[PDB]
Design an enzyme around this catalytic site. Structure first.
Site, PDB file in Angstrom:
ATOM      1  N   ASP A   1     -32.896  19.384   9.334  1.00 44.17           N
ATOM      2  CA  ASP A   1     -33.899  18.334   9.262  1.00 44.17           C
ATOM      3  C   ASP A   1     -35.223  19.018   8.954  1.00 44.17           C
ATOM      4  O   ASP A   1     -35.466  20.140   9.400  1.00 44.17           O
ATOM      5  CB  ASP A   1     -34.051  17.597  10.595  1.00 44.17           C
ATOM      6  CG  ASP A   1     -32.832  16.775  10.968  1.00 44.17           C
ATOM      7  OD1 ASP A   1     -31.993  16.479  10.088  1.00 44.17           O
ATOM      8  OD2 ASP A   1     -32.729  16.415  12.159  1.00 44.17           O
TER       9      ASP A   1
ATOM     10  N   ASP B   1     -33.917  22.575  12.892  1.00 48.50           N
ATOM     11  CA  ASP B   1     -35.022  21.625  12.917  1.00 48.50           C
ATOM     12  C   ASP B   1     -36.296  22.305  12.426  1.00 48.50           C
ATOM     13  O   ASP B   1     -36.844  23.184  13.094  1.00 48.50           O
ATOM     14  CB  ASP B   1     -35.190  21.092  14.346  1.00 48.50           C
ATOM     15  CG  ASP B   1     -36.157  19.924  14.431  1.00 48.50           C
ATOM     16  OD1 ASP B   1     -36.284  19.175  13.443  1.00 48.50           O
ATOM     17  OD2 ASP B   1     -36.778  19.744  15.496  1.00 48.50           O
TER      18      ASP B   1
ATOM     19  N   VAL C   1     -18.060  10.909  13.703  1.00 47.90           N
ATOM     20  CA  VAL C   1     -18.442  11.046  12.310  1.00 47.90           C
ATOM     21  C   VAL C   1     -19.927  10.684  12.246  1.00 47.90           C
ATOM     22  O   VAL C   1     -20.328   9.613  12.709  1.00 47.90           O
ATOM     23  CB  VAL C   1     -17.655  10.065  11.409  1.00 47.90           C
ATOM     24  CG1 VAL C   1     -18.097  10.229   9.960  1.00 47.90           C
ATOM     25  CG2 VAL C   1     -16.153  10.318  11.543  1.00 47.90           C
TER      26      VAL C   1
ATOM     27  N   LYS D   1     -15.854   7.570  42.542  1.00 52.08           N
ATOM     28  CA  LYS D   1     -15.017   8.149  41.502  1.00 52.08           C
ATOM     29  C   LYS D   1     -14.711   9.604  41.835  1.00 52.08           C
ATOM     30  O   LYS D   1     -13.606  10.075  41.609  1.00 52.08           O
ATOM     31  CB  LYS D   1     -15.708   8.053  40.140  1.00 52.08           C
ATOM     32  CG  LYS D   1     -15.605   6.664  39.501  1.00 52.08           C
ATOM     33  CD  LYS D   1     -16.475   6.557  38.251  1.00 52.08           C
ATOM     34  CE  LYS D   1     -16.147   5.287  37.474  1.00 52.08           C
ATOM     35  NZ  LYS D   1     -16.423   4.065  38.271  1.00 52.08           N
TER      36      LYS D   1
ATOM     37  N   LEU E   1     -27.297  14.195  45.553  1.00 50.74           N
ATOM     38  CA  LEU E   1     -27.967  14.662  44.354  1.00 50.74           C
ATOM     39  C   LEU E   1     -28.559  13.494  43.576  1.00 50.74           C
ATOM     40  O   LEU E   1     -27.915  12.461  43.399  1.00 50.74           O
ATOM     41  CB  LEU E   1     -26.979  15.435  43.480  1.00 50.74           C
ATOM     42  CG  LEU E   1     -26.233  16.565  44.197  1.00 50.74           C
ATOM     43  CD1 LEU E   1     -25.209  17.184  43.259  1.00 50.74           C
ATOM     44  CD2 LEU E   1     -27.230  17.614  44.680  1.00 50.74           C
TER      45      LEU E   1
ATOM     46  N   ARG F   1     -20.948  25.187  16.152  1.00 50.96           N
ATOM     47  CA  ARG F   1     -22.286  25.644  16.502  1.00 50.96           C
ATOM     48  C   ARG F   1     -22.727  26.705  15.498  1.00 50.96           C
ATOM     49  O   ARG F   1     -21.908  27.240  14.752  1.00 50.96           O
ATOM     50  CB  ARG F   1     -22.326  26.202  17.926  1.00 50.96           C
ATOM     51  CG  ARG F   1     -22.181  25.124  18.992  1.00 50.96           C
ATOM     52  CD  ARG F   1     -22.599  25.626  20.357  1.00 50.96           C
ATOM     53  NE  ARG F   1     -24.034  25.879  20.451  1.00 50.96           N
ATOM     54  CZ  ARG F   1     -24.969  24.934  20.411  1.00 50.96           C
ATOM     55  NH1 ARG F   1     -24.624  23.659  20.274  1.00 50.96           N
ATOM     56  NH2 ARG F   1     -26.252  25.264  20.526  1.00 50.96           N
TER      57      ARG F   1
ATOM     58  N   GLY G   1     -27.200  23.850  17.366  1.00 52.40           N
ATOM     59  CA  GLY G   1     -26.327  22.816  16.838  1.00 52.40           C
ATOM     60  C   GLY G   1     -26.727  22.430  15.425  1.00 52.40           C
ATOM     61  O   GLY G   1     -25.926  21.888  14.667  1.00 52.40           O
ATOM     62  N   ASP G   2     -27.981  22.704  15.081  1.00 54.55           N
ATOM     63  CA  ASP G   2     -28.510  22.403  13.754  1.00 54.55           C
ATOM     64  C   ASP G   2     -29.841  23.131  13.575  1.00 54.55           C
ATOM     65  O   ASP G   2     -30.247  23.903  14.444  1.00 54.55           O
ATOM     66  CB  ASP G   2     -28.728  20.894  13.586  1.00 54.55           C
ATOM     67  CG  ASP G   2     -29.577  20.295  14.697  1.00 54.55           C
ATOM     68  OD1 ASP G   2     -30.398  21.021  15.299  1.00 54.55           O
ATOM     69  OD2 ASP G   2     -29.433  19.081  14.963  1.00 54.55           O
TER      70      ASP G   2
HETATM   71 NA    NA Z   1     -21.527   9.083  14.743  1.00 56.12          NA
HETATM   72 NA    NA Z   2     -27.901  10.150  44.647  1.00 52.30          NA
END
Ligand code: NA
Ligand code: NA
Ligand code: NA
Ligand code: NA
Length: 327
Positions: A248, A186, A97, A66, A56, A143, A183-184
């Site tokens: 925003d 805009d 924060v 990993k 991928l 959310r 999430g907010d």
């Molecule tokens: Na932050």
């Molecule tokens: Na790859």
DNA sequence: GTCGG
DNA sequence: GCTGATGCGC
DNA sequence: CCGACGCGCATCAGC
């Protein structure tokens, strides 16, 4: 694909991503891990080996290794270690924060400030933005259900029109594409009196009206063209109050408005594909304008745009509804 | 960390 | 005080 | 091998 499919792997990569960004301050590694997590999260098969995942795009030799460790042992020694690391886990945590980035989190942890409790006891060491981020730490991580976004849009559109009926405001983001949550908020704002060749108070008047009706409750930053702050829907009588939300508002020249609405509507994958197409068609599109490209690669003056469709027409692409801009 | 010129 | 760099969030 | 992967605002660093 479902979370339970390769959730262990994607969670692992995302956690690694955060430590790179917040502790090691290696933004490009942060994005490498995010890219890998995304491509894997879309893979419709439970991965059986690192080799499989390596096919991928975005998954290389290291992440493959990993994945092999995680599949065979159910964890990653490096991740387990950093997780239990008092200093690193604290730096990583504090960046949650708003206002506290990698540098601030590092400085705080270096001087013994590692928790929200510690931050609360050291207000004089936090700037205005950070104080607000602390105050609404919990709310900012929640959310926003679409129903609430609709209530918020009602207020924003109403107040904007009230200040001047000639203003044009558009709530963008996933919300505009129909998302069930955001999430907010805009908001892109423009006014015919404001062009790229053009008052230095058009944004202020709107922010001020929203504050007057007590919708906007705090200001993180505010300039002549961009406002970032906090808002909250009016509480349903004796019912529990709504959480405070991030909002925003950007003021954009009329002649660049729709390129802006297109851009901030996304999605990111869609933007990538559209710009790719534009190029293969001899056009270059950024958040502000669409310009023709000469046979030697020289960009010409920006083309007139009076709607999102104008942009699509230029690159001979059928107009795409926001709901269908997932990619 | 991954990709690619 | 002014100018440019840095941190931050997006 | 080795470089790639934009900008407004708040605040700092330097003069
Ligand atoms: Na932050
Ligand atoms: Na790859
Ligand atoms: Na953060
Ligand atoms: Na009017």
């Amino acid at each position: 694909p479902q979370e339970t499919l390769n959730g262990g792997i994607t969670d692992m990569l995302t956690e690694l991503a955060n430590f790179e960004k917040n502790v090691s301050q290696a933004i490009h590694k942060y994005n490498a891990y995010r890219k890998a997590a995304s491509v894997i999260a879309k893979y419709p098969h439970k991965i059986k080996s690192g080799a499989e995942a390596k096919k991928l795009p975005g998954v290389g030799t290291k992440i493959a290794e990993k994945i092999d460790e995680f599949l065979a042992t159910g964890k990653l020694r490096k991740l387990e270690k950093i997780r239990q690391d008092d200093t690193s886990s604290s730096i990583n945590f504090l960046t949650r924060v708003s206002g506290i980035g990698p540098s601030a989190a590092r400085k705080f942890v270096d001087e013994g400030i590692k928790t929200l409790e510690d931050l609360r006891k050291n207000e004089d060491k936090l700037n205005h933005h950070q104080r607000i981020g602390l105050k609404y730490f919990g709310d900012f991580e929640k959310r926003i259900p679409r129903e609430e976004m609709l209530q918020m849009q009602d207020i924003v559109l109403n107040e904007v029109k009230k200040v001047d009926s000639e203003y044009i405001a558009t709530v963008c983001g996933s919300f505009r594409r129909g998302a069930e949550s955001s999430g907010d908020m805009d908001v892109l704002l423009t006014h015919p009196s404001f062009t790229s060749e053009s008052q230095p108070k058009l944004l202020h008047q709107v922010v001020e009206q929203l504050q007057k009706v007590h919708f906007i409750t705090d200001t993180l930053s505010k300039g002549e063209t961009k406002f970032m702050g906090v808002c909250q829907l009016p509480s349903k009588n004796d019912e529990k109050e709504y959480p405070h939300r991030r909002i925003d508002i950007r003021l954009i020249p009329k002649d660049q408005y729709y390129c802006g609405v297109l851009y901030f509507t996304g999605s990111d994958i869609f933007n990538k594909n559209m710009r790719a197409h534009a190029l293969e068609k001899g056009f270059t599109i950024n958040e502000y304008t669409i310009r023709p490209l000469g046979v030697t690669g020289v960009a010409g003056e920006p083309l007139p745009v009076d709607s999102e469709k104008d942009i699509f027409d230029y690159i001979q692409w059928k107009y795409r509804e926001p709901k269908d801009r997932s990619e």
